[PDB]
Structure 1
Amino acid sequence: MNIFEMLRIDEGLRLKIYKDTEGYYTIGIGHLLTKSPSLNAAKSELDKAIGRNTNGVITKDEAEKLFNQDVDAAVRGILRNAKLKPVYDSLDAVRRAALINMVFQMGETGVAGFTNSLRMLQQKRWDEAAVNLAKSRWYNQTPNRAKRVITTFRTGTWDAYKNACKXX
């Protein structure tokens, strides 16, 4: 398991424009296109992102390319942010992935706003951090995914992302 596999599990893969959990046009492995209610606006954003006239559909390789860019964007957002960077640097590799996951979902500014959770993570007060992280619109709106990310912070293991068949 690693951050790419973790997010692939959490986001899925769809090759045609779809709406995310908030109703926003998205494609691929959770690539947000626009918050505009206009499908034409989303299609424009898609064509710009891919570099061709896609008519709302992409290939798996194209989806993976946007995904790789989006994971980089999350990592860069953490590394440039005065609140996120020290927390990230203080964490082990597994918990670093959990933080990247949150930033991928909610953005740099969004996660930097979790002030009390971030402090508990820096303090390595894992059960307390996990309790605090769940007191959030994030948790209430996407509880299964938030539970997996929170378990990863609580335990520093990949257990929430394992299954009996070892894939599927």
Structure 2
Amino acid sequence: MNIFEMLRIDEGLRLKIYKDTEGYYTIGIGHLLTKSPSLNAAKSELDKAIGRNTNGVITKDEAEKLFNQDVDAAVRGILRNAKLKPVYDSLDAVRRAALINMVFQMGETGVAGFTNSLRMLQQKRWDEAAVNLAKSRWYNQTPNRAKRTITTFRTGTWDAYK
């Protein structure tokens, strides 16, 4: 198991524009297109992202390409972030993947806002961090996926994904 396989299980793969759990236009493997309510604004962002007139549909290769960019960006965002970087550096490989997953999902700013949780992770207080992580809109809105990430943080294993 690795970050790619982990996020692919969590996000799934869709080749046609779809709406995410928040109702936003997305495509491929959790690639957010726009928060705008316009489907046209979504196709536009899509064509721009892919470099061709897609008419809202992409191929598997194209999906995987956006995915690779998105993972790469998540990692680089963590490393550039003063709040996130020290947490990431402190963790083991498995838990690093959990942090990347959260960043992929809610963006760097979102994650950096989990001040108390971050401190607990840095301190290696696993059970405590897991409890604090659950007291969030994140957990309440997407509980099954949040539990998988939380368990990963708590245990340091891939059990939740197997």
Cα distance in 2, alignment partners of residues 12 and 47 from structure 1: 21
SS of corresponding position for 2:139: helix
Please list the CA deviations of residues 100-129 of structure 1 after superposition, one character each: whole Å capped at 9, or x if unmatched: 000000000110000000000000000000
Segments of structure 2 that go 5 or more residues without pairing to the other structure are none
Cα deviation, residue 2, structure 1? 0.4
Cα distance in 2, alignment partners of residues 76 and 21 from structure 1: 25
What TM-score does the superposition give when structure 1 sets the normalisation length? 0.96
Matched, 1:56 2:56: yes
Please list the CA deviations of residues 141-165 of structure 1 after superposition, one character each: whole Å capped at 9, or x if unmatched: 000000000000000000000xxxx
Cα distance in 2, alignment partners of residues 72 and 140 from structure 1: 28
Cα deviation, residue 10, structure 1? 0.1
How many pairs does the alignment contain? Answer: 161
What TM-score does the superposition give when structure 2 sets the normalisation length? 0.99
Matched, 1:151 2:137: no
Cα deviation, residue 21, structure 1? 0.4
Cα distance in 2, alignment partners of residues 145 and 124 from structure 1: 22
For 1:32, the equivalent position in structure 2 comes to 32
SS of corresponding position for 1:58: coil
RMSD: 0.3
Cα distance in 2, alignment partners of residues 115 and 94 from structure 1: 21
Please list the CA deviations of residues 21-78 of structure 1 after superposition, one character each: whole Å capped at 9, or x if unmatched: 0000000000000000000000000000000000000000000000000001110110
Cα distance in 1, alignment partners of residues 108 and 74 from structure 2: 7
Segments of structure 1 that go 5 or more residues without pairing to the other structure are 162-168
For 1:104, the equivalent position in structure 2 comes to 104
Regions of 4+ moved over 6 Å: none
Cα distance in 1, alignment partners of residues 155 and 12 from structure 2: 24
